[PDB]
């Protein structure tokens, strides 16, 4: 015998609490139930791509530790596992979390660099538009991205939006195309009791004035200026990670999001974007605190609830709640 060892359906595996990991366990369950990511590790495709000397990596330890945890969780030999080795690598390379969604951002970037196929990175001078059409600049931006960033993480999670900045003094317009690995959606302010997920996406694409976090130098004004930033979605990844920004004291707003058939087509400004419909595959919940996860199992297609070491059956009707914090969508 051993605590946690039972013969269970692969992937229906909890994670014991080991101290207080912020949103680690919930984050792992969301990534564990991203089928292209888990299949990549279960098929031993990461050994070929492990990067131990990337200056922005973790000497392969984040990818190695994560892969080995996933193999336990999908082995069918455990009802729950204690992720001590993966937690140790997170605590060693990210002490800021010892003691909140930016852990997911750290993991995506750490997995990316620990598996980055660019094994000596060129310095790339990124370039603004100058009247060139969006398709020329966007294509150019993606190849520049791929010259330094080429990994299973880019293939699965990375997309590109169009960024329009306007100088308050000079009024000059600067257009760049920037990569992203997840979207942070704002909620309406002040609180409404109910909002449609699409309203949050439309808030995301509304012109906003940069704050202290984004000091910007105007090349024309030769002046630092508080520009106006406008974001438009150019291309979307096979798995779209959507963060509901509830902390900016917490907004309990009920964000209604689709379980199936999330159509992003009306938000794509690319006329060559095809139909873009998504199905939900995972949800990280935050209780004002404690984090849990809903996830769809890739093998049986049913929904499950993950509360640390506890795994239980779930219905689609109980997923949409005020606790929803991070949504995982997979392209149809």
């Amino acid at each position: 015998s051993e605590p946690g060892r039972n013969n269970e359906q692969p992937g229906l595996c909890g994670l014991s609490n080991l101290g207080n990991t912020c949103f680690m366990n919930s984050a792992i369950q969301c990534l564990s139930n991203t089928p292209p990511l888990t299949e990549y590790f279960l098929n031993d495709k990461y050994q070929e791509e492990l990067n131990f000397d990337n200056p922005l990596g973790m000497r392969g330890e984040i990818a190695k530790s994560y892969a080995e945890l996933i193999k336990q969780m999908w082995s069918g030999k455990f009802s729950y596992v204690t992720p001590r080795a993966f937690k140790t690598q997170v605590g060693r390379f990210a002490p800021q979390f010892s003691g909140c969604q930016e852990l997911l951002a750290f993991l995506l970037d750490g997995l990316h660099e620990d598996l980055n196929r660019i094994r000596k990175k060129p310095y790339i001078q990124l370039k603004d538009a100058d009247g060139r059409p969006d398709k020329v600049v966007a294509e150019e931006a993606w190849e520049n991205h791929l010259k330094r960033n080429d990994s299973i993480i880019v293939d699965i999670f990375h997309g590109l939006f169009k960024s329009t900045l306007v100088c308050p003094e000079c009024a000059k317009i600067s257009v760049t195309f920037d990569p992203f690995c997840y979207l942070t959606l704002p909620l309406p302010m002040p609180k409404k009791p109910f909002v449609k997920l699409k309203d949050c996406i439309e808030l995301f694409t509304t012109k906003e004035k940069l704050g202290a976090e984004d000091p910007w130098y105007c090349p024309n004004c030769k002046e630092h200026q508080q520009a106006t930033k406008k974001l438009d979605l150019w291309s979307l990844p096979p798995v779209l990670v959507v963060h509901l920004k509830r902390f900016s004291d917490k907004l309990d707003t009920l964000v209604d999001f689709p379980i199936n058939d999330l159509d992003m087509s009306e938000f794509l400004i690319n006329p060559n974007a095809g139909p873009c419909r998504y199905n939900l595959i995972a949800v990280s919940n935050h209780y004002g605190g404690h984090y849990t996860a809903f996830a769809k199992n890739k093998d049986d297609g049913k929904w499950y609830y993950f509360d640390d070491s506890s795994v239980s059956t779930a219905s689609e009707d109980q997923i949409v709640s005020k606790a929803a914090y991070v949504l995982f969508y997979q392209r149809q």
Partner: protein
């Protein structure tokens, strides 16, 4: 080969620097010390929500010209 970048002070003021893509983060902290007299011991540099670690070049972070780093006092 050289380029201009900026750092936002604690006082929300801006410092101009001449820099190469091959210069290390320590060296940039030394240029910040030559200009604001602040020891690299108490310098943390942030760009794109990411802390710049010592030992890496600014090419490692793909720092572009006219980039403005954030300076925080440790």
């Amino acid at each position: 080969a050289a380029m201009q970048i900026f750092v936002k002070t604690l006082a929300s003021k801006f410092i101009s620097l001449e820099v190469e893509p091959s210069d290390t983060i320590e060296n940039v902290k030394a240029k910040i010390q030559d200009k604001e007299g602040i020891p690299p011991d108490q310098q943390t540099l942030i760009f794109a929500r990411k802390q710049l670690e010592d030992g890496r070049t600014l090419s490692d972070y793909n720092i572009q010209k006219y980039s403005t780093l954030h300076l925080l006092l440790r």
